[PDB]
């Protein structure tokens, strides 16, 4: 009773943001319902708010409105609805909704494509911090870079979201971490088991693995962050060493990076562009990070909870801990 949606008046004022009544939906023939119990908030939504990404939602998703818009990418909560060809679920079941654009609303509908069950173990709002972080950095480090045991990996910002599920993904590869953060996260970083910590807001993370590998650089570069990182990210990578980019305001384009270093693979992507472009992608992701959850090699990661009533101070927080830390709203 009295399901609501998140939505915004009009661009760039996150004071705009209002839970609004909505309307349910019946599922369509291979589709679930889902009652939402937290969802994962993440930098993109606050771009999208502010009016930052309007020319991609127009020419991605025919978005023209402010409006028009709706948040959250991921969530966690309980069937609540199943369409009429959907056997594997049952209302009351526990899941986790994997790839969304509207998981800040009371009820969702999704394909079943896009649904895993909740392990009994986790909260709703540990399950919460799973999907993006996990299929992002599961693509980047086992399917574009195809990291292998005793390769070097520098992780930026690997105090935030998808720096520690890929942490956690390239410990269980066998890979030799080197982490970016700010220095008041180094000793989180230490108590995952990362022996090399560095400054991500200074540029001599370069010169300290140069130091520390005599000379060979890293294998592998999982990016996010923007700017002077980009070419520096890029010296430090070994002869045909993989860059894999995930940041998406003021990334390069691959002629800029293909000319600084001719030597390199540049693997930039969105995941969600991704699993648009390779059928059958989503599933797979899914399937290998169960069997590391089955194996015991997966961990919900430490989060900022806020309350639904607490949105806009959600969101202004999710600017803060843009490269540190894994948020989730809590839903009434």
Known sequence: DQPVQLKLSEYGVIDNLNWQPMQRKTPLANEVEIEVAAVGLNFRDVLNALGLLKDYYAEHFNITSA?????????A?????????????????????????????????????????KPKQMSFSEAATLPLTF??????????????????????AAAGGVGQAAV????????????????????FLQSLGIKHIMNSRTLDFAEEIMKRTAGEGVDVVL????????????????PKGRFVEIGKIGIWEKEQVKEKR??????????????????????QLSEELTQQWNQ?????????????????????????AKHVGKVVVSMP
Request: aromatic share 10%.
């Open 77 to 117: 909560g309980k069937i609540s609805a199943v369409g009429e060809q959907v056997s594997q679920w049952q209302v009351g079941d526990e899941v986790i909704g994997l790839l969304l654009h509207d998981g800040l609303s009371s009820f969702i509908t999704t394909s079943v494509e896009y649904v895993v069950a």
């Open 135 to 156: 299929l992002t950095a599961q693509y980047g480090l086992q399917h574009l870079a195809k990291i292998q045991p005793g390769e070097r990996v520098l992780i930026h």
């Open 223 to 238: 990016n996010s962050l923007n700017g002077e990182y980009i070419p520096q990210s890029l010296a430090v990578l070994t």
């Open 296 to 320: 015991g090699k997966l961990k919900a990661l430490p989060h900022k909870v806020f309350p639904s009533t607490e949105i806009t101070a959600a969101f202004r927080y999710m600017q803060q």
């Open 67 to 75: 409006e028009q818009l709706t948040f959250g990418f991921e969530c």
């Open 168 to 187: 956690q993904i390239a410990q269980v590869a066998g890979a030799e971490i080197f982490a970016t953060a700010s220095p008041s996260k180094w000793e």
């Open 262 to 283: 001719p030597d390199v693979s540049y693997f930039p992507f969105d995941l969600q562009e991704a699993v648009q472009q390779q059928p059958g992608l989503i599933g």
